[PDB]
């Protein structure tokens, strides 16, 4: 058996084909087992519509999830990614930094 804690990165990207649009991303990487719960939050509230959830695995059966959706950040509000995993004794909340 192996278990590996997910690394969690929260960042924003503009797709080059539509640069005015902006996407909030939570990249959850290197985890095992694959069982997981991942949400994007706005002001602590689950964002129910997340357009993209792309899961894959590597040769060593570590899993990778990109969880992302279109958003429009202003100076208002707090955005985050919340992850629950067996390796994590409490849910891990990683806030989005507007400079990322």
Residue numbers in the entry: 0 to 99
What does the paper say about this structure?
The protein forms the noncovalently bound light chain of the major histocompatibility complex class 1 (MHC 1) and is important for antigen presentation. More recently, two single-point variants of this protein, D76N and V27M, have been identified in amyloid deposits in the viscera or tongue, respectively, with the former occurring in the absence of kidney disease.
To examine the structural effect of other amino acid substitutions at this site, the crystal structures of seven variants (D76E-, D76A-, D76S-, D76G-, D76Q-, D76Y-, and D76K-β2m) were determined at high resolution (1.15 to 1.52 Å). Comparison of the crystal structures of D76E-, D76A-, D76S-, D76G-, D76Q-, D76Y-, and D76K-β2m with those of WT- and D76N-β2m revealed no substantial differences that could explain their different stabilities and aggregation propensities (RMSD < 0.6 Å over all heavy atoms). For D76N-β2m, the network of hydrogen bonds involving the sidechains of N42, T73, and Y78 found in the CD and EF loops of WT-β2m is maintained in the variant. For other variants, the loop structure is maintained despite these hydrogen bonds either not forming (D76A-, D76G-, and D76Y-β2m), or being reduced in number (D76K-β2m hydrogen bonds to N42, and D76S-β2m hydrogen bonds to N42 and T73). Together, these observations indicate that the sidechain chemistry at residue 76 plays a role in protein stability and aggregation, but the behavior of the variants cannot be rationalized by their crystal structures alone.
